[PDB]
Design a binder for this molecule. Structure first.
Ligand code: NA
Ligand code: NA
Ligand code: NA
Ligand code: NA
Ligand code: NA
Ligand code: NA
Ligand code: NA
Ligand code: NA
Lengths: 489, 490, 491, 491
């Protein structure tokens, strides 16, 4: 797939940060390389945000929050900006899909059909909420007017991971912007480009200077500078547990509100009365979608004893059938993992799996001559206490586990520190809702898997997170509630 | 002297048991501590002291009660009725409970009765009403799915409360939690265990299932920490000091555990040029002096437009000097002692720090009476924004009075603070009142009033005064996990 | 085995039954009275004061006063809630007395009145007590230059009229929501069944309701009912009953641009698909129509059965129908009482005769029962077609039609081919089928694998000609408020 | 100086104006046409196809089919949203064309049409686009045995009738809410002002609305109007306009138990208290009435003035009245245009004559203006009492009565002593007085230190005989929704 002219021009120059409505270099001039994970080549050279750059972005966001058009605009004017931003992203859909394929590694056609569509729709959806963020009037006494206001919290720092780089930026920014906050946001070092391209479109849509500030760089410097900044009012992070925990401990010092979206080890449960054809397809897609680089991937596939060997046989064939290649080549179904480090991590987990006694029924090694490719992998002969069953692998790797009763699968499914999502396959109306009610996860799909939409909340129970993104629910993260009492005698 | 109620005598005449799994019990290791009467300094009761092991027993009971048996299976109508029967019982025991508050915490009995017990009753009545009404969403996305959310109780919640409004504080924790269907492990402050441990009898009589509520009296370092660090508690909520608030957020990180915190303040109470001055003088005085200043949302910075500053200082000084200090169980008392010797010493050292930095004690500024933990109502003037006493929460009957010259100036100076719990604004102008309310960074703003709370209105801090809200519908969301269910109907 | 009369019921019934206006038990101004009957025995059960247009006037003036000034107008929402809760506690204390009154006056079995009606009544008040403090409006972010807020103000004096089939429960569907908003109430019970409401007036008084907040005016539809409908100073009307009256009500309400809520009748389908759990569906189909003697607006009076199970379900329905124990509501043996009046017995027996002459076959029942009182046998009609009178029209008795079908598309179309739309049942074990069918039925309530469930928290009301508006739930509140949008210029 | 006509406007007016049915521009089946006029010149402005009963039937069938099957029924909520936002974008792109059509057909000044009416229409659609994905029902925690959820389903085919005073804006107040719920529409504009709607139909098509989702049927009350009101296959009706028609519509809707929303007239009070900012309140009182030539249901047609200020306010209003520049809407200097028709001018002049006959003083104006066109001078009446016709009745012209008062209790009582209750204004600097007075005024919208402000997000509608129900805001959606309560047995 030949590069669009605007992608070629963008990549032909150093990639600048976006602060206070301007494209700028890091103050101290540092740069870093992002790669193409299919070729291992340097894809661009990007300006590297340091602490002093974050502090500049924070002042920019503070000023835009406190005075100027953003602080003065009506809600309808604010909605219109977000709507225009969505339209612009849709206009640049092929450019942005190419950058995602190039920079992240995923198939261009998927980045275009799924990731760009979702980002557009998320911004459309949240433009909608700007004029509808309502407080209460509260009837207490004839002597007072009691009302609440849902005020924006102020300057928000946001950090996102590399698996759905553009989409993830929209999960953070659509709700935050809709409330009237301003933003200092950091993309992942592996994937800065789609966001920094999208910056052009915030400027074009007419966002006032400093409303949005994009600071690409590395967790331990740019990331930690966001986490530790005294003038950031609220933090939101999606990423590592270790980083999640760190963020929470640091935010303690300022009594700062945190939203976290972390990992999972989500179960996808095939009951005796499932439509087995459709469940097999849901189980396969459930783990293999986005190369398994998906926090809510259905990495534990629980299968009723009667169907266990049927599903294993089908999963093995489908895994071997997947077409691996560069995301910018048209026949590719599954691209490489994002980095050498991730490839080595996923291959390490496969070795640990075999070491602990499990059997690789398909895959279980690297693929192709170069690039960070891993073959789709199916593990079988697996038990609940194995490392590969307990821990999030974050690649195209599924464990398949038989079970004999519904009480049992619920227990086993819930016996996890994680609780991001779950799938249940059954044609029975009672069993579907009953099993859904008892699973400890933020999202349950009945007879489907991996569905997300702007309108429906997503987040973790237990150690898969604190709080919800998407829906009306996301808005509450970026608001402070003021209770006003007017003595009316 | 107010004579002790028969049921109060009876209660005080034996060891005060903790309440676990529906039973009154001693600590497993038999440890006990003393609570005191702060007006007299005498030992008031001997109370069973919860240790780590007793928190574990409580958590096990709450877990069991949550996962199966009547509390798990009950309809929301049946749950609501339990909570309303509890409120009715507390109301029947109102005199006994108000006496225990006056005795244990130190506040005037008639205020405990008219304010504290009344609010607790109303907070439970209000929350009983929410059980049947904690609704999720059905979400129109596509003709191919039913999309709905469930607001599920989060599970066992651990709650820690302070000593300044002991019983009311217990109700701000438990009303919302219980309405959601959570089960509870709650620790009263070691200075004020008694009203809660008495009210325990009422939960049992109301018909609460074993283990749905569990009260574990003791100390921050042991009972407190055991709640904070317990792996099987799903969610924590705390009201109290900042150091503990930070500690609790820090520790909750290890479990990715949701935290709600209600912390202290340095709340401004602002008298503008067109205030009704007589009303605003009364509201400025009551704003700080109510509950002996032991009030996180106390109006401890009184900002007074230059035209009225001398007039207001003069009045506050006279009012301060006239307040009648005495024991909470003496009928003539207007203000009781502080809760402890340590608090009295804390406040008095703040006062000394204020004099050391150049402020003037216009009234008060010393201990009171021959015994008990009393501090005189104190008014400081000649104060500047950089002074320790104007920055930090004193938590006694100590007010600073600051003049100002412009609205824009006072809004800046009111907001120049790490705290953001509450604020008051006094002006007769409809545009000024709302404009100033809007610009203040405070979780509650009163226009032409101060210190009003009601179960239906949320309360809590911006900035370092807290995370989250209590009261209102808003409190409920702390105790809920949201589950998004997608049903393929293609 | 006769259920023994509560002493309090015997005392109530030993005197003329007064109406309740402005806090006091009073006679009609003109002293007219009427008779209510015991439909099991046909005896006079009580003599009741008959409200005339002038008694409505006095009730309306009393409600107006209580709304505009005095304790009901001044009370906090907490205070108002507490009255409503205390009323619910009093009803629960008098549960036996009230259930006997239902059984005597209405006819239904005592145990059913106690377990169902009285408990629903109590729960309805407790649920709406809970709303008083939670009737919130909005603050609306538009511009920095304005504060924009709404108030959900009580409409004022509300006129309510209720039917005889669930006398006390129906009073609480009207008053719980109206009282929660802070309205004041002029309410007329059915001439057939005045007594449980008038007994309950004691408990409003004991609970501490201010004078005039509630006013109960027993009498007939053409005098007392019409008076409430036509009264210039009633702000809003709510009615449950006959369509012809519902139409009249809507027509008269035009003249004053008055908001109307209507809950009307139905011809609700109860649909057994091929993959139904036949055990529970057959029980659901039988209780769906026979509950309350078929005197139930949302009765499942059309039972559609997939061709595969048609014979099975017809045979089982006929057996159950023939096994029902008919008798007095105050005899412990009774499973089904009489119909409420001679007029209604005659109406239902007319429909049955009409069903016979249009060609349908009575597979069970189809006639009067026992030696006295207004009893009709449980009746099952087979060999029916969709254009029959008995399949189209509401019968309001223990009369079911059974219709086979061959495809899901077909049953949805036939179920929906009705001017009514109150309720529907769908029996299928399939998770996709249950929701899809539920989505496509035009009915205010759809039960999936059940039938006849109501709860204070879940709204109820008609599509099409089964009504306007909803009762129960948070939804009922909105009928009793006017929304006021306030703009405060803040520069 | 004349505003020069846009090319697209000339083009549109150079042919017969077709109606819009099932996605196509068509003539009336029987070929009837009617004339609309330019009320500044009294010239024929356009010839418009006239919908008859038969054309209404065709629009209803198209809407029915669009509702039951096809893209509109199948589309996601995101897809439906996007159609609505794109419509808003198109309207904005054609803002000058649409503003000219409004100036020409309705009368109002071009620049006000542009800045106010067109901006409000655009923002209305953008607001409602945003609701499509957010129309949520409830999950309701009752028992562990059931999942209880509600669906807010679109009612179906909706019949809407709008007046001539804000033609395009009024069209958006009906369709934004309705289309956001998934309903389909048969909408009739006023015969006096059909053009802007029928121009806008081109933009519904260009946005990509499926065939029959919207259908525009211009014509006359007694034929087109009545056919919408009386149609058996319209599910719900909404109307804005006269009282006599409002009452007709409610009466006719009884026959089908059809939900009705009415936005009717007012005689709204604009109260200037002793502590008002007097300069701002005089400007608010003058604009409250004279905006849109007084052709405004919520016009502040009763200016109450505290006695201290009475003379001052009278003198100011008189000066301001006599200073308004009357002229054609398409003339750049015009501050106020003519009334919409000869009949309206005659009505307003008949009112003014009644006021004189009853003893009131024409302080300014009170007669027609200019050499042709339906102009009336801005008119100020003094020496007025509460019982006069001109004080009680809605005149719908640029005519104000000015009433002195002496106490706040007095002005509230006199303000509320009306069958109308659409809107009110209160002018006071005092924070307690403002909210207190606002709490007591029986009106759907209360402005404190302002007047005539509307926004898509803030509900609007009448207390008493000013209406039933609310338009705008979240509240408007409920009128277009049937609530279904689903119970899923999960035992
Ligand atoms: Na990369
Ligand atoms: Na968590
Ligand atoms: Na103590
Ligand atoms: Na905070
Ligand atoms: Na009777
Ligand atoms: Na209807
Ligand atoms: Na015209
Ligand atoms: Na009305």
């Amino acid at each position: 797939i030949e590069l669009k002219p605007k992608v070629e021009a963008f990549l032909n120059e150093e990639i600048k940060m976006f602060i206070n409505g301007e494209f700028v270099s890091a103050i101290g001039g540092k740069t870093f390389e992002t790669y193409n994970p299919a070729t291992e080549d340097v894809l661009a050279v990007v300006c590297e945000a340091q602490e002093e750059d974050i502090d500049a972005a924070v002042k920019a966001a503070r000023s835009a929050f406190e005075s100027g058009p953003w602080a003065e605009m009506t809600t309808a004017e604010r909605a219109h900006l977000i709507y225009k931003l969505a339209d612009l992203i849709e206009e640049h859909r092929e450019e942005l899909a190419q950058l995602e394929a190039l920079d992240n590694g995923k198939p261009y056609q998927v980045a275009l059909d799924d990731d760009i569509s979702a980002t557009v729709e998320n911004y459309r959806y949240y433009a909608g909420w700007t004029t509808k963020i309502i407080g209460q009037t509260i009837p207490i006494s004839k002597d007072y007017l009691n009302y609440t206001r849902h005020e924006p919290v102020g300057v928000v720092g946001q950090i996102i991971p590399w698996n759905f780089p553009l989409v993830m930026s929209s999960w953070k920014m659509g709700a935050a912007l809709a409330t009237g906050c301003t933003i200092v946001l950091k993309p992942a070092s592996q994937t800065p480009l789609s966001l920094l391209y999208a910056a052009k479109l915030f400027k074009e849509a007419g966002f006032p200077n400093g409303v949005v500030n994009f600071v690409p760089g590395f967790g331990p410097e740019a990331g930690a500078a966001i986490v530790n900044h005294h003038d950031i009012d609220k933090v939101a992070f999606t990423g590592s547990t270790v980083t999640g925990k760190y963020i929470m401990r640091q935010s303690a010092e300022m009594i700062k509100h945190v939203t976290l979206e972390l990992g999972g080890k989500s179960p996808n449960i095939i009951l005796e009365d499932a439509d087995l054809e459709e469940a097999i397809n849901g189980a396969f897609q459930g783990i293999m979608y986005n190369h398994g680089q998906n926090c809510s991937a259905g990495s534990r596939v629980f299968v009723h004893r009667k169907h266990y060997e049927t599903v294993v046989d089908a999963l093995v064939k489908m895994a071997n059938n997947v077409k691996l290649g560069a995301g910018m080549e048209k026949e590719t179904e599954m691209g490489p993992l994002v980095s050498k480090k991730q490839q080595e991590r996923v291959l390490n987990y496969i070795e640990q799996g075999k070491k602990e006694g499990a059997t690789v029924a398909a895959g279980g090694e690297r693929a192709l001559e170069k690039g960070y490719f891993v073959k789709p992998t199916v593990f079988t002969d697996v038990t609940d206490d194995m490392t590969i069953v307990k821990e999030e692998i974050f690649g195209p790797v599924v464990v398949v586990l038989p079970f004999d009763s519904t009480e049992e699968v619920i227990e086993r499914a819930n016996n996890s520190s994680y609780g991001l999502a779950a799938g249940v396959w059954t044609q029975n109306i009672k069993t579907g809702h009953q099993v859904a009610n008892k699973l400890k996860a933020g999202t349950v799909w009945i007879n489907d898997y991996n569905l997300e939409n702007a309108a429906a909340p997503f987040g973790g129970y237990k150690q898969s997170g604190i709080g919800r993104e998407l829906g009306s629910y996301a808005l509450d993260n970026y608001t402070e509630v003021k209770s006003v009492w007017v003595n009316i005698k």
